Amino acid sequence: QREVRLPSGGSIVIDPTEALTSIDINSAGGDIEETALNTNLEAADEIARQLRLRDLGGLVVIDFIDMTPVRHQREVENRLREAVRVDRARVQIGRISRFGLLEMSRQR
Amino acid sequence: QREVRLPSGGSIVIDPTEALTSIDINSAKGGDIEETALNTNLEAADEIARQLRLRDLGGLVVIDFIDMTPVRHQREVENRLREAVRVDRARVQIGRISRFGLLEMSRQR
């Protein structure tokens, strides 16, 4: 319930706090950047599903595995935005910061 | 030790997690809330810098400052935190308050 395993072996850890929900992403060898991208894309889909099941509201901070190509960062952000558009709750998604964190909000 | 009181009665709540430490800022009746919000956030900035060193916190820290509309107020709080940590022996990176009202920073423990 706190740790959700991803299809390729990695996992997401959902930690509630007073101000917000923090989500950590862990990877499971091939190429790092390609496994990081793959794990982060699997994480985006699972995060969207968990936001709905647990019906989380307020601010969410996601620590995706660091990727160097900016295009990879946009691909993960876009994956998360597409994954949540079916959610009935209004969702706002920021951009990955220089600290490798993504901020988002969900009303309800 | 999870909750630290601020001079004007407000408080900061520190919650360590897998990926980062989150810090929530709580205010303490008829006065302009903006000046109240700024004062609390400025006291919180000083207390956060103190707790970072005292607990020797490492990694990413996300701070939820009370929301302020004036961009000048946001920079004052950001500048207060940068000045409050410049004496810290540890290497510190400080971001800016986002459109979500959160500030990200990092401290090399």
mmCIF file of C-alpha atoms in Angstrom:
data_model
loop_
_atom_site.group_PDB
_atom_site.id
_atom_site.type_symbol
_atom_site.label_atom_id
_atom_site.label_comp_id
_atom_site.label_asym_id
_atom_site.label_seq_id
_atom_site.Cartn_x
_atom_site.Cartn_y
_atom_site.Cartn_z
ATOM 1 C CA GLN A 1 0.000 0.000 0.000
ATOM 2 C CA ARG A 2 3.017 2.283 0.814
ATOM 3 C CA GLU A 3 5.334 0.700 -1.841
ATOM 4 C CA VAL A 4 3.938 -0.211 -5.321
ATOM 5 C CA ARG A 5 6.206 -2.381 -7.570
ATOM 6 C CA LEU A 6 6.468 -1.346 -11.275
ATOM 7 C CA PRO A 7 6.330 -3.735 -14.291
ATOM 8 C CA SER A 8 10.138 -3.680 -14.949
ATOM 9 C CA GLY A 9 11.107 -4.283 -11.259
ATOM 10 C CA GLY A 10 11.362 -0.668 -9.984
ATOM 11 C CA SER A 11 8.926 0.832 -7.451
ATOM 12 C CA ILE A 12 7.175 4.016 -6.198
ATOM 13 C CA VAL A 13 7.015 4.835 -2.449
ATOM 14 C CA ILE A 14 4.052 7.090 -1.435
ATOM 15 C CA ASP A 15 4.734 9.085 1.793
ATOM 16 C CA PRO A 16 1.984 11.385 3.193
ATOM 17 C CA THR A 17 3.161 14.490 5.171
ATOM 18 C CA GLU A 18 1.398 17.513 6.752
ATOM 19 C CA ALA A 19 2.016 19.832 3.722
ATOM 20 C CA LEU A 20 1.978 17.294 0.848
ATOM 21 C CA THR A 21 2.349 13.700 -0.469
ATOM 22 C CA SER A 22 5.917 12.825 -1.519
ATOM 23 C CA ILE A 23 6.446 9.990 -4.061
ATOM 24 C CA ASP A 24 9.905 8.406 -4.488
ATOM 25 C CA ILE A 25 10.816 6.299 -7.572
ATOM 26 C CA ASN A 26 13.353 3.392 -7.330
ATOM 27 C CA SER A 27 14.791 1.543 -10.395
ATOM 28 C CA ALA A 28 15.410 -2.269 -10.508
ATOM 29 C CA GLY A 29 22.342 -4.255 -16.873
ATOM 30 C CA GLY A 30 21.480 -2.120 -19.957
ATOM 31 C CA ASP A 31 21.822 1.682 -20.532
ATOM 32 C CA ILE A 32 21.067 3.906 -17.450
ATOM 33 C CA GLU A 33 19.283 6.815 -19.296
ATOM 34 C CA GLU A 34 17.029 4.332 -21.204
ATOM 35 C CA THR A 35 16.169 2.329 -17.999
ATOM 36 C CA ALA A 36 15.632 5.647 -16.101
ATOM 37 C CA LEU A 37 13.222 6.875 -18.835
ATOM 38 C CA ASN A 38 11.387 3.446 -18.918
ATOM 39 C CA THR A 39 11.064 3.312 -15.076
ATOM 40 C CA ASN A 40 9.850 6.977 -14.927
ATOM 41 C CA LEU A 41 7.231 6.281 -17.681
ATOM 42 C CA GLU A 42 5.996 3.184 -15.758
ATOM 43 C CA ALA A 43 5.989 5.393 -12.583
ATOM 44 C CA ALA A 44 3.848 8.122 -14.268
ATOM 45 C CA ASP A 45 1.065 5.587 -15.129
ATOM 46 C CA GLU A 46 1.087 4.003 -11.638
ATOM 47 C CA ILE A 47 1.111 7.473 -9.949
ATOM 48 C CA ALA A 48 -1.994 8.499 -11.970
ATOM 49 C CA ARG A 49 -3.767 5.240 -10.905
ATOM 50 C CA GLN A 50 -2.759 5.644 -7.198
ATOM 51 C CA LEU A 51 -3.902 9.324 -7.177
ATOM 52 C CA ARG A 52 -7.394 8.079 -8.143
ATOM 53 C CA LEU A 53 -7.609 4.906 -5.916
ATOM 54 C CA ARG A 54 -6.335 6.655 -2.730
ATOM 55 C CA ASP A 55 -8.275 9.816 -3.871
ATOM 56 C CA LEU A 56 -5.295 12.015 -2.818
ATOM 57 C CA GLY A 57 -5.841 15.810 -2.727
ATOM 58 C CA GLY A 58 -3.505 18.802 -2.404
ATOM 59 C CA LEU A 59 0.183 18.982 -3.439
ATOM 60 C CA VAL A 60 2.226 15.985 -4.637
ATOM 61 C CA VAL A 61 6.018 16.079 -5.121
ATOM 62 C CA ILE A 62 7.482 13.272 -7.290
ATOM 63 C CA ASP A 63 11.208 12.372 -7.263
ATOM 64 C CA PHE A 64 11.634 10.776 -10.728
ATOM 65 C CA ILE A 65 14.966 9.066 -11.538
ATOM 66 C CA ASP A 66 17.248 11.881 -12.864
ATOM 67 C CA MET A 67 17.500 12.078 -16.655
ATOM 68 C CA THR A 68 19.958 14.354 -18.475
ATOM 69 C CA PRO A 69 18.115 14.885 -21.830
ATOM 70 C CA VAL A 70 15.450 17.641 -21.392
ATOM 71 C CA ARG A 71 13.296 15.797 -24.048
ATOM 72 C CA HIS A 72 13.177 12.766 -21.643
ATOM 73 C CA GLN A 73 11.935 15.123 -18.864
ATOM 74 C CA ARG A 74 9.185 16.476 -21.219
ATOM 75 C CA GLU A 75 8.273 12.860 -22.255
ATOM 76 C CA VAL A 76 7.744 11.904 -18.545
ATOM 77 C CA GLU A 77 5.759 15.134 -17.767
ATOM 78 C CA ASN A 78 3.612 14.522 -20.938
ATOM 79 C CA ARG A 79 3.085 10.845 -19.925
ATOM 80 C CA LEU A 80 1.818 11.990 -16.472
ATOM 81 C CA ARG A 81 -0.421 14.731 -17.974
ATOM 82 C CA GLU A 82 -1.950 12.254 -20.502
ATOM 83 C CA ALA A 83 -2.350 9.576 -17.753
ATOM 84 C CA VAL A 84 -4.340 11.940 -15.436
ATOM 85 C CA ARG A 85 -6.589 13.574 -18.110
ATOM 86 C CA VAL A 86 -9.255 10.784 -17.612
ATOM 87 C CA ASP A 87 -9.331 11.530 -13.818
ATOM 88 C CA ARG A 88 -12.548 13.402 -12.814
ATOM 89 C CA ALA A 89 -10.459 15.520 -10.342
ATOM 90 C CA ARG A 90 -8.813 18.728 -11.722
ATOM 91 C CA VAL A 91 -5.009 18.044 -11.899
ATOM 92 C CA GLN A 92 -2.193 20.649 -12.407
ATOM 93 C CA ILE A 93 1.310 19.356 -13.367
ATOM 94 C CA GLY A 94 4.513 21.451 -13.148
ATOM 95 C CA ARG A 95 7.923 20.731 -14.766
ATOM 96 C CA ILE A 96 10.909 18.715 -13.442
ATOM 97 C CA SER A 97 13.109 21.228 -11.477
ATOM 98 C CA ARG A 98 16.942 21.437 -11.316
ATOM 99 C CA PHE A 99 16.484 19.341 -8.092
ATOM 100 C CA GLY A 100 14.924 16.513 -10.176
ATOM 101 C CA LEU A 101 11.498 16.970 -8.492
ATOM 102 C CA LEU A 102 8.049 17.374 -10.109
ATOM 103 C CA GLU A 103 5.314 19.356 -8.283
ATOM 104 C CA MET A 104 1.637 18.754 -9.011
ATOM 105 C CA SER A 105 -1.753 19.386 -7.418
ATOM 106 C CA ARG A 106 -5.093 17.459 -7.405
ATOM 107 C CA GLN A 107 -8.418 19.050 -6.230
ATOM 108 C CA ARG A 108 -10.098 16.385 -3.948
ATOM 109 C CA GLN B 1 10.937 18.045 17.840
ATOM 110 C CA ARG B 2 8.631 17.380 14.809
ATOM 111 C CA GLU B 3 6.874 20.757 15.460
ATOM 112 C CA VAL B 4 8.941 23.929 16.327
ATOM 113 C CA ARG B 5 7.098 27.093 17.550
ATOM 114 C CA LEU B 6 7.853 30.463 15.851
ATOM 115 C CA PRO B 7 8.339 33.766 17.759
ATOM 116 C CA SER B 8 4.860 35.122 16.722
ATOM 117 C CA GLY B 9 3.121 31.850 17.801
ATOM 118 C CA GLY B 10 3.263 30.142 14.359
ATOM 119 C CA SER B 11 5.176 26.892 13.748
ATOM 120 C CA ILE B 12 7.120 24.670 11.279
ATOM 121 C CA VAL B 13 6.355 20.890 11.052
ATOM 122 C CA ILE B 14 9.307 18.742 9.793
ATOM 123 C CA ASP B 15 8.438 15.360 8.149
ATOM 124 C CA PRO B 16 11.378 13.274 6.773
ATOM 125 C CA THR B 17 10.384 10.876 3.914
ATOM 126 C CA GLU B 18 12.151 8.458 1.489
ATOM 127 C CA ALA B 19 12.902 11.133 -1.221
ATOM 128 C CA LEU B 20 12.935 14.360 0.838
ATOM 129 C CA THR B 21 12.155 16.235 4.063
ATOM 130 C CA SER B 22 8.951 18.300 3.885
ATOM 131 C CA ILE B 23 8.483 21.350 6.144
ATOM 132 C CA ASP B 24 4.978 22.842 6.615
ATOM 133 C CA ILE B 25 4.588 26.478 7.894
ATOM 134 C CA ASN B 26 1.545 27.250 10.144
ATOM 135 C CA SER B 27 0.478 30.849 11.048
ATOM 136 C CA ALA B 28 -0.690 31.763 14.614
ATOM 137 C CA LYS B 29 -7.394 38.768 13.768
ATOM 138 C CA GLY B 30 -8.289 41.935 11.752
ATOM 139 C CA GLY B 31 -4.803 42.908 10.469
ATOM 140 C CA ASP B 32 -3.680 42.614 6.794
ATOM 141 C CA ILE B 33 -2.915 38.840 6.365
ATOM 142 C CA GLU B 34 -0.184 39.584 3.716
ATOM 143 C CA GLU B 35 2.069 41.319 6.317
ATOM 144 C CA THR B 36 1.170 38.465 8.755
ATOM 145 C CA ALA B 37 2.066 35.864 6.065
ATOM 146 C CA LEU B 38 5.398 37.607 5.261
ATOM 147 C CA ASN B 39 6.418 37.923 8.978
ATOM 148 C CA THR B 40 5.625 34.222 9.705
ATOM 149 C CA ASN B 41 7.518 33.104 6.522
ATOM 150 C CA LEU B 42 10.529 35.289 7.502
ATOM 151 C CA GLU B 43 10.569 33.776 11.043
ATOM 152 C CA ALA B 44 10.143 30.300 9.461
ATOM 153 C CA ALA B 45 13.121 30.941 7.134
ATOM 154 C CA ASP B 46 15.385 31.736 10.156
ATOM 155 C CA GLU B 47 14.092 28.710 12.142
ATOM 156 C CA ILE B 48 14.448 26.346 9.110
ATOM 157 C CA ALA B 49 18.099 27.419 8.654
ATOM 158 C CA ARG B 50 18.672 26.707 12.401
ATOM 159 C CA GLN B 51 16.970 23.224 12.320
ATOM 160 C CA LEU B 52 18.878 22.230 9.098
ATOM 161 C CA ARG B 53 22.212 22.644 10.975
ATOM 162 C CA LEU B 54 21.005 21.330 14.413
ATOM 163 C CA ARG B 55 19.603 18.050 12.913
ATOM 164 C CA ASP B 56 22.410 18.034 10.248
ATOM 165 C CA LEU B 57 19.671 17.338 7.607
ATOM 166 C CA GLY B 58 20.886 16.019 4.227
ATOM 167 C CA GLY B 59 19.288 15.671 0.775
ATOM 168 C CA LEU B 60 16.255 17.496 -0.660
ATOM 169 C CA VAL B 61 13.981 19.716 1.477
ATOM 170 C CA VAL B 62 10.580 21.040 0.265
ATOM 171 C CA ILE B 63 9.168 24.022 2.221
ATOM 172 C CA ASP B 64 5.471 25.028 2.123
ATOM 173 C CA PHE B 65 5.648 28.810 2.906
ATOM 174 C CA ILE B 66 2.322 30.609 3.559
ATOM 175 C CA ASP B 67 1.060 31.827 0.136
ATOM 176 C CA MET B 68 1.925 35.449 -0.712
ATOM 177 C CA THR B 69 0.657 37.273 -3.820
ATOM 178 C CA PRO B 70 3.289 40.097 -4.139
ATOM 179 C CA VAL B 71 6.340 38.768 -6.078
ATOM 180 C CA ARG B 72 8.476 41.214 -3.966
ATOM 181 C CA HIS B 73 7.343 39.285 -0.784
ATOM 182 C CA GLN B 74 8.341 35.948 -2.400
ATOM 183 C CA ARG B 75 11.881 37.265 -3.159
ATOM 184 C CA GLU B 76 12.176 38.730 0.420
ATOM 185 C CA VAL B 77 11.446 35.226 1.887
ATOM 186 C CA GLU B 78 13.793 33.543 -0.656
ATOM 187 C CA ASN B 79 16.527 36.139 0.121
ATOM 188 C CA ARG B 80 15.923 35.666 3.921
ATOM 189 C CA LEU B 81 16.480 31.863 3.606
ATOM 190 C CA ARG B 82 19.632 32.288 1.397
ATOM 191 C CA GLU B 83 21.093 34.793 3.951
ATOM 192 C CA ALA B 84 20.084 32.582 6.932
ATOM 193 C CA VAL B 85 21.986 29.526 5.445
ATOM 194 C CA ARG B 86 25.157 31.362 4.121
ATOM 195 C CA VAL B 87 26.803 30.736 7.584
ATOM 196 C CA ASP B 88 26.064 26.953 7.350
ATOM 197 C CA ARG B 89 29.321 24.971 6.788
ATOM 198 C CA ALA B 90 27.323 22.510 4.568
ATOM 199 C CA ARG B 91 26.878 23.110 0.780
ATOM 200 C CA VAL B 92 23.273 24.388 0.226
ATOM 201 C CA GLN B 93 21.289 24.930 -3.043
ATOM 202 C CA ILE B 94 18.122 27.112 -2.726
ATOM 203 C CA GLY B 95 15.384 27.263 -5.421
ATOM 204 C CA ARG B 96 12.472 29.738 -5.697
ATOM 205 C CA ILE B 97 8.802 29.636 -4.573
ATOM 206 C CA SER B 98 6.875 27.860 -7.420
ATOM 207 C CA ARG B 99 3.310 28.495 -8.713
ATOM 208 C CA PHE B 100 2.312 25.765 -6.182
ATOM 209 C CA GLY B 101 3.750 27.880 -3.311
ATOM 210 C CA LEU B 102 6.596 25.399 -2.575
ATOM 211 C CA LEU B 103 10.346 26.089 -2.328
ATOM 212 C CA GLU B 104 12.861 23.309 -3.073
ATOM 213 C CA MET B 105 16.371 23.227 -1.633
ATOM 214 C CA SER B 106 19.186 20.760 -0.978
ATOM 215 C CA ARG B 107 21.765 20.397 1.836
ATOM 216 C CA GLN B 108 24.955 18.245 1.567
ATOM 217 C CA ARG B 109 25.098 16.531 5.033
#
